Amino acid sequence: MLFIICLVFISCNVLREVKYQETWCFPAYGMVIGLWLMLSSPQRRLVLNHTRGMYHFSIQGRTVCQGPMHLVYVRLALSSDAYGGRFFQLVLCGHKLEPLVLVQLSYEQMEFLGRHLARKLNINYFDYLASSYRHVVRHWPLGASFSPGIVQRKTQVYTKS
Amino acid sequence: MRWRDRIAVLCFPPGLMLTVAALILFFIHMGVFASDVHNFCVIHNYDHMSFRYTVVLIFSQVISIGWAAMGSLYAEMTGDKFLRCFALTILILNGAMFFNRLCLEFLAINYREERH
Amino acid sequence: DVQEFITQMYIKQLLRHPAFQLLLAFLLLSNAITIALRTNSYLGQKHYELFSTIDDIVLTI
Amino acid sequence: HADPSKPIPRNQFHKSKETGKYKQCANVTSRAMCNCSEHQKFSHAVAFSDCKEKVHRFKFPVTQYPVVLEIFNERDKISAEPPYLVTMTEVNMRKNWQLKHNEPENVKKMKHYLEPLLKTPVYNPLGLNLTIQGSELFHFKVSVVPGVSFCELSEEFQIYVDEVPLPFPGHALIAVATSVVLGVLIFIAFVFQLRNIH
Ligand SMILES: *[C@@H]1O[C@H](CO)[C@@H](O[C@@H]2O[C@H](CO)[C@@H](O)[C@H](O)[C@H]2NC(C)=O)[C@H](O)[C@H]1NC(C)=O
Ligand SMILES: *[C@@H]1O[C@H](CO)[C@@H](O)[C@H](O)[C@H]1NC(C)=O
Ligand SMILES: *[C@@H]1O[C@H](CO)[C@@H](O)[C@H](O)[C@H]1NC(C)=O
């Protein structure tokens, strides 16, 4: 969310110098300024340890968590809209990472780099081999502990009747 | 001892960031209200109050209430009972400040200036 | 990711909820009545305090 | 309506106590010692204020209040003419009032010359309109500009506007009050539902 830190901090600067010349109306746009630096802080880098089928989460060189990737496949959950709309949410291996959802899904090049990446990461691209509508089977490696959802992950998945 | 060691190394789950960010706001507000109710009442001085910032005070108190709400549910969504008995007060705690900072305004209404 | 959908589920079940819509309609309709009554110099003053309050309440909502 | 042998309406604050002076009925203790004639009470002049008790009352916004100025010349009383340009001041120093006037091309040059020298705007009689946005007494003073008469022409009147609706921080505040008061009840359900599912 450094883009927001990039966004708010710029707004503060343009709001840093001004001449309102109005009674009261105290120039207290600095309440934004704190919100700028707040989201600024620690780069995240995730490495696919496909050699042992592992996935360890860390950022800025400090491990947070790890888990094996024995069952590996690409899944994208449906994020429906209150209007008559369809949006994409990408949840891979039934885990809660940074959302790799399909941006501007409502993009062929956007999904093209994914197939190379899924080929680069050596995991199946289920939502790409057949990409028309909501069709993905989550792999959910047995290394994860998403029991209320990992089992439920297939429940939302269609078994093709 | 595990609980602190983890979050000492790295960042925090979302609920902690917002909720505590309303505790500082609760103090920053508790200071100003104290001085304003000081000057209105004890030194009986009507010059060193707010009324130059009567909007930013109220605006923040809305943020300080809202941010507590968003942070609270995350704790209750996680369900940690320690947070659960913690944040709920902070919602009602800042709920006390808002209903007090609002009666200090209808009291110092004939002491601020004029607009109509 | 598991949690906020419920919060999104909550946002939907509130915003799309019909009691909320009915309340907002009631407020906007009352404000329209106030506008119609303000189109009268006499009643413009007597309840000026009420019309101004309603005027601001609807805007904040 | 100074009856000095009484308490005083607003002494909270120190500066208010310091800024006080009884110009008439100045040292006596019983309002009895000072003599206020009936005409003294009736007239709106300054230095007659201590004898003033009854004033003209006005409903909140006073809009288009006509300031009719009549010049009396023994045999006749004529209306105030554009040559007799005039200035309005508020002796009590209040500043929530406006004056509207029409400027015909007979004073564009009189008005433009006098305003920097006098440092106070000059108005055209016969078209004066007064507008008031206040909740208490207003004491105005009408003075013909110097240099056009040998006799200072002047005039005093008082307006007490009551029924003012509310100082600003009292509608934006009620607005935010109801919203947050509502928004809490909304927040109640969101938490309350979590305990029900659990
Ligand atoms: C001050 O107010 C008076 C109203 O008492 C205005 O006089 C009216 O002026 C209009 C022209 O706009 C005439 O049609 C009316 O007949 C006038 N009424 C009276 C009673 O004279 C006057 O115009 C206002 N002053 C200014 C500068 O606008
Ligand atoms: C009392 O007031 C009178 C004004 O009527 C003034 O001349 C006199 O100096 C005052 N004396 C004292 C002691 O205040
Ligand atoms: C008022 O009149 C009385 C007599 O009626 C007189 O004794 C008194 O001096 C007068 N007041 C003043 C301030 O002179």
End-to-end Cα distance, chain C: 30
Q: Are strands D57-58 and D62-66 parallel, antiparallel or unpaired?
A: unpaired
**3-state SS track over chain D:** CCCCCCCCCCCCCCHHHHCCCCCCCCCCCCCCCCCCCHHHHHCCCCCCHHHCCCCCEECCCEEEEECCCEEEECCEEEECCCCCCEEEEECCCCCCEEEECCCCCCCCCHHHHHHHHHCCCCECCCCCEEEECCCCEEEEEEEECCCCCCCCCEEEEEEEECCCCCCCCCCHHHHHHHHHHHHHHHHHHHHHHHHHHC
Measured in angstroms, the CA of D67 and the nearest CA of chain C are apart by 23
Which residues have CB under 8 Å from C9's CB, separation 6+? Answer: none
CB B84 within 8 A of CB B16: no
Token pair listed for A86: 């369809």
Cβ of D64 less than 6 Å from ligand 1: yes
* CA distances in angstroms from A97 to A78, A91, A151, B66, D139, listed in the order given: 16, 8, 19, 26, 72
Nearest protein CA to atom 9 of ligand 2, as residue = D27
R_g of chain B computed on alpha carbons: 18
Cβ-based neighbours of D49, under 8 Å, separated by 6 or more: D2, D23, D24, D139
Distance separating alpha carbons of residues C33 and B65, to the nearest angstrom = 33
Note the resolution in Å, 1 decimal.
2.9
Note the residue count of chain D. Answer: 198
Round to whole Å and give the CA distance between B17 and B71.
8
DSSP A145: -
- Give, in order, the Cα–Cα distances in Å from D16 to each of B45, D11, D168: 11, 6, 23
> Maximum CA pair distance of chain D?
97
Chain B stretch 44-63, residues whose beta carbon is closer than 8 A to a beta carbon of chain A: 52-53, 55-56, 59-60, 63
Cα–Cα dist A74/A122, whole Å: 11
For residues A4 and A10, what is the distance between their CA atoms, to the nearest angstrom?
Answer: 10
Q: Cβ distance A93 to A69 under 8 Å?
A: yes
Sheet with D137-144, edge to edge strand ranges:
D57-58, D154-161, D137-144, D86-90
Extract the tokens encoding A114: 């994914």
Calpha distance D17→B115 (Å, rounded):
25
Say if the Cβ atoms of B62 and D180 lie within 8 Å: yes
Among B108, B88, B90, B101, smallest CA distance to B46 is for B108
Whether residue D33 has its Cβ less than 6 Å from ligand 3:
yes
Radius of gyration for the alpha carbons in chain D, expressed in angstroms and rounded = 25
| 3-class DSSP state of A58 | strand
Cα Rg, chain C, nearest whole Å = 17
Unique residue bearing structure tokens 């993009």:
A107
Q: Please list every residue in chain D whose beta carbon sits closer than 8 Å to the beta carbon of residue C10.
A: 190, 193
Q: Which alpha helices (H) appear in B1-116, and where do they start and end?
A: 2-9, 14-41, 54-78, 81-101, 103-107
User: What is the CA(D93)–ligand 1 centre distance, in A?
Assistant: 28
Residue A125 three-state SS: coil
Q: In chain A, helix, strand, coil percent, each to 5? A: 35, 20, 50
- Parallel, antiparallel, or unpaired: how do β-strands D57-58 and D154-161 relate? parallel
- The helix (H) or strand (E) run that includes residue C53 is helix C48-60
Helix/strand number for chain C, H first, E second: 4, 0
Residue B36: both structure tokens together: 């304003």
Q: Cα separation of A28 and A16, whole Å? A: 10
Whether B29 contacts B64, CB under 8 Å: yes
Cα–Cα distance measured from residue C42 to residue C27, given in angstroms and rounded to the nearest whole number? 23
Distance D3 CA to ligand 2 centre (A): 17
Of B77, B105, B110, the CB nearest to D173: B105
Which residues, in sequence order, are bridge partners of residue D71?
Answer: D78
Spatial CA neighbour of A137 closest among A78, A74, A95:
A74
Distance of CA A122 to CAs A72, A117, B53, Å? 9, 8, 59
Cβ distance D26 to D37 under 8 Å?
no
